[PDB]
């Protein structure tokens, strides 16, 4: 055109939408910290499920 | 009367042992739940 548009605003809106979608999904803090927290939560859920299975299946009383 | 009291005491001891076992299992479950959080 100038051989003789709104890219900045478009990029800003795209970045805002991506940040909103990440904060809705969980991308609001550092990635390594979020991954460690997710692994810890999964380990805690697995331990709770294992404890429930061990306390429910092998019933002491009858 | 002594025989009846002995039978009732044995039944009550069995029930108390069952209640104590249930309480111990519940305490272990609660300690595991607190340690897991």
Swiss-Prot record, chain A:
It is found in: Nucleus. The modification Phosphoserine is found at residue 30. Residues 5-58 form a coiled coil. Belongs to the Mediator complex subunit 9 family. Component of the Mediator complex, which is composed of MED1, MED4, MED6, MED7, MED8, MED9, MED10, MED11, MED12, MED13, MED13L, MED14, MED15, MED16, MED17, MED18, MED19, MED20, MED21, MED22, MED23, MED24, MED25, MED26, MED27, MED29, MED30, MED31, CCNC, CDK8 and CDC2L6/CDK11. The MED12, MED13, CCNC and CDK8 subunits form a distinct module termed the CDK8 module. Mediator containing the CDK8 module is less active than Mediator lacking this module in supporting transcriptional activation. Component of the Mediator complex, a coactivator involved in the regulated transcription of nearly all RNA polymerase II-dependent genes. Mediator functions as a bridge to convey information from gene-specific regulatory proteins to the basal RNA polymerase II transcription machinery. Mediator is recruited to promoters by direct interactions with regulatory proteins and serves as a scaffold for the assembly of a functional preinitiation complex with RNA polymerase II and the general transcription factors. This is Mediator of RNA polymerase II transcription subunit 9. It comes from Mus musculus.
From Swiss-Prot, chain B:
It is found in: Nucleus. One of its GO terms (biological process) is positive regulation of transcription by RNA polymerase II. Belongs to the Mediator complex subunit 21 family. The chain holds residues 97 to 133 of 144 of the full protein. GO terms for molecular function: transcription coactivator activity; ubiquitin protein ligase activity. Expressed in brain, heart, kidney, liver, lung, skeletal muscles, spleen and testis. Component of the Mediator complex, which is composed of MED1, MED4, MED6, MED7, MED8, MED9, MED10, MED11, MED12, MED13, MED13L, MED14, MED15, MED16, MED17, MED18, MED19, MED20, MED21, MED22, MED23, MED24, MED25, MED26, MED27, MED29, MED30, MED31, CCNC, CDK8 and CDC2L6/CDK11. The MED12, MED13, CCNC and CDK8 subunits form a distinct module termed the CDK8 module. Mediator containing the CDK8 module is less active than Mediator lacking this module in supporting transcriptional activation. Keywords: Activator, Nucleus, Transcription, Transcription regulation. GO terms for cellular component: core mediator complex; mediator complex; nucleoplasm; nucleus; ubiquitin ligase complex. It comes from Mus musculus. This is Mediator of RNA polymerase II transcription subunit 21. Component of the Mediator complex, a coactivator involved in the regulated transcription of nearly all RNA polymerase II-dependent genes. Mediator functions as a bridge to convey information from gene-specific regulatory proteins to the basal RNA polymerase II transcription machinery. Mediator is recruited to promoters by direct interactions with regulatory proteins and serves as a scaffold for the assembly of a functional preinitiation complex with RNA polymerase II and the general transcription factors. Its main location: nucleus. The lineage of its organism: Eukaryota, Metazoa, Chordata, Craniata, Vertebrata.
């Amino acid at each position: 055109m100038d051989k003789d548009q709104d890219l900045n605003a478009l990029k800003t809106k795209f970045q805002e939408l991506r940040k909103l979608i990440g904060t809705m999904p969980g991308i609001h803090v550092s990635p390594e910290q979020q991954q460690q927290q997710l692994h810890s939560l999964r380990e805690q859920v697995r331990t709770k499920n294992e404890l429930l299975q061990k306390y429910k299946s092998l019933c002491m009383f009858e | 009367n002594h025989e009846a009291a002995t039978c009732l005491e044995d039944v009550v001891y069995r029930g108390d042992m069952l209640l104590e076992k249930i309480q111990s299992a519940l305490a272990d479950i609660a300690q595991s739940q607190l340690k897991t959080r």
